[PDB]
């Protein structure tokens, strides 16, 4: 298998808003769960051993034995039979305290047609203004249907200088972050989607370009969602992977 190439082609959707995904069309989507079985965040499988997520998802415990990753799932609760459920062995937080972290699985994930890593961007690459991307997760829906199933939403990327204007996020967004969403509102990632992916199609595969982090509410007008810019941490991520 090749990274970022799903074995089920995802539906262009005509998480708040968006739609329920085709089962297993996003094979790198991870459900990060407490030791005692509660979904609380998302993550992205970037190789058989490594899960990329948000640092703040881990604040309630520094012990790896407190977390387990769920791979290949479509439902939040009553998981399918062939879902993979691997304990986390190590936790690595980015060393300048940005909102991204790495989990190391205790046994590598079996790569099947339902569990496939996503590709990493070239380091320090800037996703251009108005690039169409996708967000996925099991997060809050605010009555836009799809509760309890893996949802997706198609979002345009909004460049930082525009996103940082007073009428939008008014300076809050750092250069190691990116914004995405519809300025009209109605579509966003929401609570329960943190750590999950923002991927953008390039040539023939999806490239993980952001990690779901924060926002001023969800799906509000003039308030797009903010994501950690994954290309700014690629050299770090690779250094951790190659030494652990």
């Amino acid at each position: 298998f090749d990274c970022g190439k799903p074995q089920v082609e995802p539906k262009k959707c005509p998480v708040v808003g968006g739609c329920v995904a085709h089962p297993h069309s996003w094979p790198w989507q991870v459900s990060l769960r407490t030791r005692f079985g509660m979904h609380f965040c998302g993550g992205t499988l970037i190789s058989p051993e490594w899960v990329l997520t948000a640092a703040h998802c881990l604040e309630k415990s520094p012990r790896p034995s407190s977390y387990k990753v769920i791979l290949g799932a479509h439902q939040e609760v009553n998981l399918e039979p062939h879902v993979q459920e691997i304990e986390v062995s190590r936790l690595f937080l980015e060393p300048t305290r940005k909102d991204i972290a790495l989990l190391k699985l205790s046994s590598p994930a079996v790569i099947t047609d339902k569990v496939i890593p996503a590709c990493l961007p070239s380091p320090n690459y800037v996703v251009a203004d108005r690039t169409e991307c996708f967000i996925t997760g099991w997060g809050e829906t605010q009555g836009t249907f799809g509760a309890g199933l893996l949802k997706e939403a198609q979002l345009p990327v909004i460049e930082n200088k525009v996103c940082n204007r007073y009428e939008f996020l008014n300076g809050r967004v750092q250069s190691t972050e990116l914004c995405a969403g519809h300025l009209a509102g109605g579509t966003d990632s929401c609570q329960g989607d943190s750590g999950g992916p923002l991927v953008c199609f390039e040539k023939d595969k999806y490239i993980l370009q952001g990690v779901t982090s924060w926002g001023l509410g969800c799906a509000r007008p003039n308030k797009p969602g903010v994501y950690v810019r994954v290309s700014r941490f690629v050299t770090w991520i690779e250094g951790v992977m190659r030494n652990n």
Binding site: S213, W214, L216
Partner: peptide, 14 residues
């Protein structure tokens, strides 16, 4: 106003 999108979320006065 900044709210991190975990469950449960973490919100700040900005």
């Amino acid at each position: 106003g900044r709210a991190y999108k975990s469950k449960p979320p973490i919100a700040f006065p900005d």
